[PDB]
Ligand binder design. Structure first.
Ligand SMILES: Nc1ncnc2c1ncn2[C@@H]1O[C@H](COP(=O)(O)OP(=O)(O)NP(=O)(O)O)[C@@H](O)[C@H]1O
Ligand SMILES: Nc1ncnc2c1ncn2[C@@H]1O[C@H](COP(=O)(O)OP(=O)(O)NP(=O)(O)O)[C@@H](O)[C@H]1O
Ligand SMILES: [Mg+2]
Lengths: 132, 260, 96, 259, 129, 127, 256, 136, 258, 93, 131, 108
């Protein structure tokens, strides 16, 4: 029975090395406040950006119960801290049909709200100003 | 005496029944033989003694205590003193033949390893298989498989050995070895042997109380010699081995015409 | 199952009924009655199996390993009854 | 017609209820009592050599044939969309959503599941189960209990090599047969989901697949006919009942946690 | 037992696996009229500002002047809506899901101010001619 | 024995409980139909009212004709409806969009706007 | 070098003798045919236990496979904008990727591993040698009607496995998700399926039926006549068939 | 049994054709054609089996495009149906597209027989000349 | 004269099975072929039939040669053998009536009113005339041999061979097959041989006995001359003698405990 | 093989094993209607398959009103009728 | 013979199957451009719309830093004048790019192109139209 | 059979036998491993993307293969397409024009 523990240990080693092929080769290697008027197609856990680099995610998308304006919250890590107050937030998409992401451009700490906004644009009302 | 006493067992499975009113006793120190034709219940008769099945209204005892009244722990500690073998070979095949005989004495951890090796070499020497203790049971013979179970049968010093039809289709070279070890077993140790083989001139030479089972009834209560002078027609069909008699011998058929 | 071994010289005073499971105080302690023993007495017994005979066969050999001699007196008849069953050879159970 | 056809249809309902209740009592008595790890721990290695590592021939010979056919047929579907760099999104997702542990349980039931029925049933024909029943512990805890836990820790441990070879089989057909770049083929898998949806959900899918397969394998071998005509009849009965217990279970399992 | 005990285990085991086959099962109504629909269907998302607030139960046609009418489904979290609010048929992206845009009324009410959809084939006729 | 008969109708009742759970033809005349085929959604206001059977062709004048269907519940449509073949986006789904500006079984609608292709519009806006 | 290589050639000759016996036994059963009126009651007997007895495993697993591909196909089309096109990934996957590949593995359990049992049990009870002894060839009475019972029934059972799992989109898409029937059926009409997906699927199912029957009619005929040898050959029938359907699938998909 | 397996194999034989009509009559278009030549200089996306059109309806397919070995001009073989044999020389040929990224099809706006040639054709449009003429 | 074989030395692999054996039976006499369990006994009848091919020697049968014939001229002479097996050699798909009528349905010269007559009265010899509508799986171990016995006499052969008959049956069934074999040679006149090792039952109607030892022939006496014959080998096989040339013990080492 | 008729009896010549029964079976209803005796003197041997046709000549003979006798019969029919237990279909001695 | 007969029939059946497996797996020029656009390996080169061959490799000059590509033209069409032009056009409207050989009014093996046009650039199409 | 067992053994074995730096104004939708091309043919990619803490301009660190070392000073980057040893900077850069403000100069 001496060869039984050797082949079992090979089978136990083959099950651990194959788990690294689906983990290492595969994808297993402070909160702010704002509001908008038109969101587009965003949802929860969206990759917010300051132009192409990722900094955090979106907790949820809520709406105001008085004016019915949507409120957007997002988390920003503490490595990037000094941002001015006139940093406008614009809504763009990743190319043509990719997932939309908040592309902000440049100290707003936890509990602070970004005042300036720039809502997204749907393709139905831009042609009213493009043609007429 | 009165080791089993087998009173009023039926064991009806479905629409057919195996026994109705058989009742026989087994003395201590003798060899009991229960013979009968094929097709009827012979393997299931020995399972009633051990306790693997339960009869309808039976009275199977083992020295006073009742086997249907036993618990799971009371069914044990008396099964270890029976050691019933089988016809097809009651030995395993995943290990060698040396560990096959030493199976019921290794899970009972009370013997050390120098004393364990000397016990098996005395068991296999009594059956004549001590020099072949380094093989696999797949390449064993038909008669040598029954001798390997006989060395395992006396491994726990039992009191009622059940032989599930020994030497039923064996060579008379190997049949003479099996008929000699059972006859010398009661002459030195004193263990009751229960043989249910239907081979008449071999089962009667080593037994003292034969019980012919015909039409699910014990039709013979005599000794091994008293059944030869019995003028009963059901008794004088199985011992002498004749063609015609109480059986219809062809079929319970019908009309001879309309088929030509 | 008393299993009493008493050293009264070279007699070993073997009494008690041992089958399979009461051999542990006798096998773990067996280096005290092999050096100066000649006679082994088996008179106060009732029955003996091959399990108790396995320890007995490993003690006549151990006292013959230093090797004064081992002789047997007052031995029961059940020992030589199964000796022809197990096909025992010579120079292992001296009866004469 | 109204009564004679009903007398045999309902009689089969009692027989299929007595058969279904016998499999529950066999697994319950094989798992409770005294769970010691001194006699069954050397038996766990013995029942894993003929089940776990003996089933390696259907992992190396296969896998590379199901991995390349999902990349060859995936490349033809991904034509006229300019999504050939997203071939890793087709390979790494299909091995964890529909393929993977589903088709590996069908291979485990035909290689280790069919051999498990031919092991207990072969021993009960020569009266080896009844021999140890009257001299030791009953074989429900001796020869059935280590065989149950052997197949439980095998099928999740065998499906992680099936999803790793098929991904490696998809990497062989991608960058060495079609000529796409290795920088974007592996990065398409880095943006795919590999947490809470694909790696965890495929592990719990193979755990429940490792219970329903070995339950029919240990029941058709234990409860069978002692003649030789019933051994091969119960051997081919295991593959049909396990295929309905895996593909039939995959429909009611993909409704949960997948939408 | 052989016959009696193996019946109660069979019905108890069948009451646990077949019961798991049944656990796999994963508003106030407004009203409006229309001229052109486009690509709406059942369970169409109705939304304020871009975020969805409900679905669409059904959509039928009024067989008098042949004008389409839809059924709305808004949750009770939003009630303060005026009669000035219009309803335009837009899409989510280029050719995505057709949704209803909603830029105090209760259950069983109607909206008069609505704007119909525009097909780009009719836009191609106006841009050319 | 009687308990086996009671469950015998229960296996049948459990099976049966699981098993329990006017167009009139019109005609149209167009010059070019574009990407038009069978089962195309005809509409008055976006809500579908029928489909088409086939597209036929005369072997002398070469004018394709549309055999469209209207349900009996829609019966107030006149023959003055402008059948404008609009396309549904960029997918080429040229759906029949008739616009009313009595059509019964066997009538040809006069006002029929053909689907203008995009290969002469680039030859018109540029030239 | 030489002590470990001398035992390597012992298993290299027995492989050629095992594979050589499968071609010699098949060539003796593919000779000049007798009167076809004699094998006419013998063909319907061997088509019942192979074709009719393997019908429940094909149909019941057909609606279970087609509903999984319809449900899982709706997840990858949610990220896209082609949710209405359920005509693909329910029909095109069951024609070339699945279909003859997955149902041949299920054919080796009900009609494949049982075909080697009814020919392997006759080797143990000496029914083949007794039928051979009287007046008839054993290779043209118990093997030749069983060879035509697998190469004909399996292409006739593959189209049943296609046509049952192809209306799973009528269940998953229609009346569950709300996909239009005109947007689901007509998306399957416009797909080019006449030569690459219809008759190429039929050629793939014909050559798969010969490989399952050739192994199932050989493991029961080439076996040790005992109870352990039949069950050993019954286990090896599924392994040799699963590595032949999946093994001849990468080679056959290159000629698309 | 003889009269038991013969009944069940009849359902197995009709399920073969029931699976056949569920494929041909559902998922496919399965249920005396002369040849004309035409010469262009920019065929665009004119591949094999291109649907010939006159007024939007399909009247046949093409076989294979062939390059002229002398003047280096592409040639396409036209196969229209026998039901339409009233086409004059005046009828021109314009290569159009069914949408933005649609399939490049052939649109058609004495009487020709087998062996006839046509003179006045119009080729497809190229993206480089359209944006060049718009800016210049 | 001789009809079976002259000198056969069939070896299968490295283990020898037969080493220059010689068998001689008469025409219409019971020949006893006794042998131990494990030696070649099933493969001895395969050499006469033609399932396997021997390596050396000759097998002659009525002025012919068995290993020298082709597939033709062997299939036509094989209808006069009609061997019987130890296990169930009858099929399981057909019933008992179609099993006996199977070897006579290859020629079909007898029409349908003549087909039901020659099989029904043939079952009356073995006693299975009433068991003509049952299943072969429902038959017993002794009734399966009587069903193959009526099947073996369907073509009226000239040399019947059995493969260990009544080896594991009760003495009631053992008395049936002895009387059925002896009544087929006293009335019909067909040679039939018994290869079973049941010494008090095979040596009851036999006329020539053959003892098989060390893969050779050690005795060729009759049923009476072998009992009064001084030999330690053929008396070991007879009447159940344990000790003799067979040492009944495996060769071992020194038999010492360690 | 000949089945000639004197006018009240018939004679059977040749062999009858399994295959020469074919010309006698097709006309087996005309050569019994005027028969009071059956002769089998010029025969060689009879087996089971040939004895079945001899049983298929008495079953349609006794229903007209006349019986049949047997003269000049070898022992081969008599040693074969006791093997299959034919009580009255074959006349013994 | 049987032992020596089942070996030769086994090596002949495998040789016929491996022969069935091998049947189951079944002049250059140069052109120096300024911008290639989106052309890749095995890209079709056409003249008048019909294809005549493909390209082999797309390398870069280490000195002048101009993209030089290699094409292939079959032997069916050889008479091509040396005043031809090369235009960069894409298939359809947004599909994969190809190479259109605009021939003019002897090309041997190893000749270079003469009139090469630069590829389409979307950054000047919005720049020249605006400015 | 010994010579034909040691030669078929090997017959079965024979059956198997430098970094640059640049800065832009608005990089747009630039991500990791974005290729830079010398007129179309790929030569390298990017490795690090950060922004300045002073002026907040997205700088791009790109890598070129070492086979091409003849790069003049007039080389301009345009979103990557190229119109200098290791550790040098790139000044004349034109960035990617987003589609939100180019239409504003077209409408007004
Ligand atoms: N579990 C069971 N189910 C149905 N019938 C059984 C079962 N166990 C035994 N029998 C039958 O009970 C009868 C008793 O046979 P058994 O006790 O095996 O003695 P036996 O006949 O001498 N041995 P054997 O001939 O090998 O069956 C037989 O007819 C068996 O078929
Ligand atoms: N094809 C075979 N391959 C290997 N060994 C075989 C083969 N055929 C027979 N043998 C062996 O040859 C020997 C001759 O046995 P056999 O001729 O069957 O007589 P037998 O032993 O009395 N009948 P049995 O006991 O049922 O095997 C046995 O050891 C068989 O195992
Ligand atoms: Mg038994």
């Amino acid at each position: 029975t001496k060869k039984n523990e050797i082949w079992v240990g090979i089978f136990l080693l083959a099950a651990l090395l194959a788990a690294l092929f689906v983990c290492l080769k595969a994808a297993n290697v402070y909160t702010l406040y704002a509001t908008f008027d038109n969101i587009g197609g965003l949802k929860a856990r969206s990759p917010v950006s300051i132009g192409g680099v990722v900094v955090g995610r979106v907790a949820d998308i809520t709406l105001d119960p008085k004016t019915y304006l949507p409120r957007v919250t997002l988390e920003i890590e503490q490595r990037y801290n000094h941002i001015p107050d006139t940093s406008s937030l614009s809504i763009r998409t990743s190319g043509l049909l990719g997932e939309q992401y908040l592309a902000l451009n440049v100290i707003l700490k936890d509990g602070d709200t970004i005042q300036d906004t720039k809502s997204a644009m749907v393709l139905e009302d831009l042609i009213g100003q493009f043609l007429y | 005496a009165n080791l089993v006493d087998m009173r009023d067992v039926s064991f009806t499975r479905g629409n057919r029944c195996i026994f109705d009113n058989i009742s026989l006793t087994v003395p201590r120190g003798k060899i009991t033989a229960i013979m009968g034709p094929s097709g009827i219940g012979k393997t299931t008769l020995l399972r009633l003694i051990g306790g693997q099945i339960a009869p309808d209204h039976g009275e199977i005892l083992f020295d006073g205590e009742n086997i249907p009244a036993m618990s799971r722990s009371r069914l044990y500690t008396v099964r270890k003193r029976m050691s019933m073998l089988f016809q097809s070979g009651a030995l395993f095949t995943d290990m060698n033949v040396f560990d096959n005989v030493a199976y019921p004495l290794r899970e009972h951890t009370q013997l050390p390893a120098p004393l364990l090796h000397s016990t098996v070499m005395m068991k296999l020497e009594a059956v004549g298989l001590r020099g072949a203790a380094k093989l696999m049971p797949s390449e064993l013979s038909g008669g040598m498989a029954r001798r390997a179970a006989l060395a395992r049968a006396i491994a726990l010093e039992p009191d009622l050995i059940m032989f599930d039809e020994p030497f039923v289709g064996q060579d008379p070279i190997t049949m003479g070895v099996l008929v000699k070890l059972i006859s010398e077993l009661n002459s030195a140790l004193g263990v009751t042997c229960v043989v249910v083989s239907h081979d008449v001139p071999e089962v009667l030479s080593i037994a003292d109380h034969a019980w012919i089972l015909a039409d699910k009834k014990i039709v013979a209560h005599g000794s091994a010699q008293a059944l030869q002078a019995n003028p009963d027609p059901r008794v004088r069909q199985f011992l002498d081995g004749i063609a015609d008699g109480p059986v219809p011998f062809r079929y319970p058929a019908g009309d001879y015409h309309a088929d030509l | 199952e008393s299993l009493s071994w008493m050293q009264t010289g070279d007699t070993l005073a073997l009494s008690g009924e041992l089958d399979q499971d009461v051999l542990l105080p006798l096998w773990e302690m067996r280096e005290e009655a092999v050096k100066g023993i000649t006679c082994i007495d088996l008179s106060r017994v009732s029955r003996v199996d091959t399990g108790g005979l396995a320890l007995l066969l490993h003690l006549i050999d151990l006292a013959k390993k230093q090797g004064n001699n081992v002789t047997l007196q007052g031995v029961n008849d059940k020992v030589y009854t199964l000796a022809k069953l197990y096909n025992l050879p010579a120079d292992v159970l001296p009866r004469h | 017609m109204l009564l004679n056809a009903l007398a045999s249809l309902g009689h089969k309902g009692i027989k299929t209820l007595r058969t279904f209740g016998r499999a529950g009592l066999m697994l319950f008595n094989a798992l409770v009592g005294k769970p010691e790890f001194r006699k069954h721990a050397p038996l766990l290695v013995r029942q894993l050599y003929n089940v776990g590592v003996l089933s390696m021939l259907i992992i190396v010979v296969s896998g590379v044939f199901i991995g390349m056919v999902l990349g060859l047929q995936g490349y033809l579907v991904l034509t006229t969309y300019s999504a050939e760099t997203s071939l890793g999104m087709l390979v790494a997702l299909s091995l964890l959503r529909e393929l993977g542990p589903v088709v590996a349980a069908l291979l485990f039931a035909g290689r280790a599941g069919s051999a498990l029925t031919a092991e207990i049933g072969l021993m009960r024909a020569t009266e080896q189960l009844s021999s140890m029943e009257m001299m030791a512990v009953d074989p429900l805890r001796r020869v059935i209990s280590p065989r149950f836990w052997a197949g439980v820790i095998s099928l999740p441990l065998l499906t992680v090599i099936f999803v790793a070879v098929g991904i490696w089989g998809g990497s062989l057909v991608g960058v060495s047969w079609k000529g796409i770049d290795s920088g974007f083929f592996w990065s398409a898998m880095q943006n795919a989901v590999d947490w809470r949806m694909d790696l965890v959900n495929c592990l719990i899918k193979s755990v429940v697949f490792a219970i329903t397969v070995t339950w029919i394998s240990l029941f058709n071998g234990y409860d069978a006919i002692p003649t030789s005509a019933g051994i091969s009849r119960a051997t081919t009965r295991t593959v049909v009942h396990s295929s309905l217990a895996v593909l039939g279970l995959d429909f009611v399992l993909t409704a949960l946690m997948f939408g």
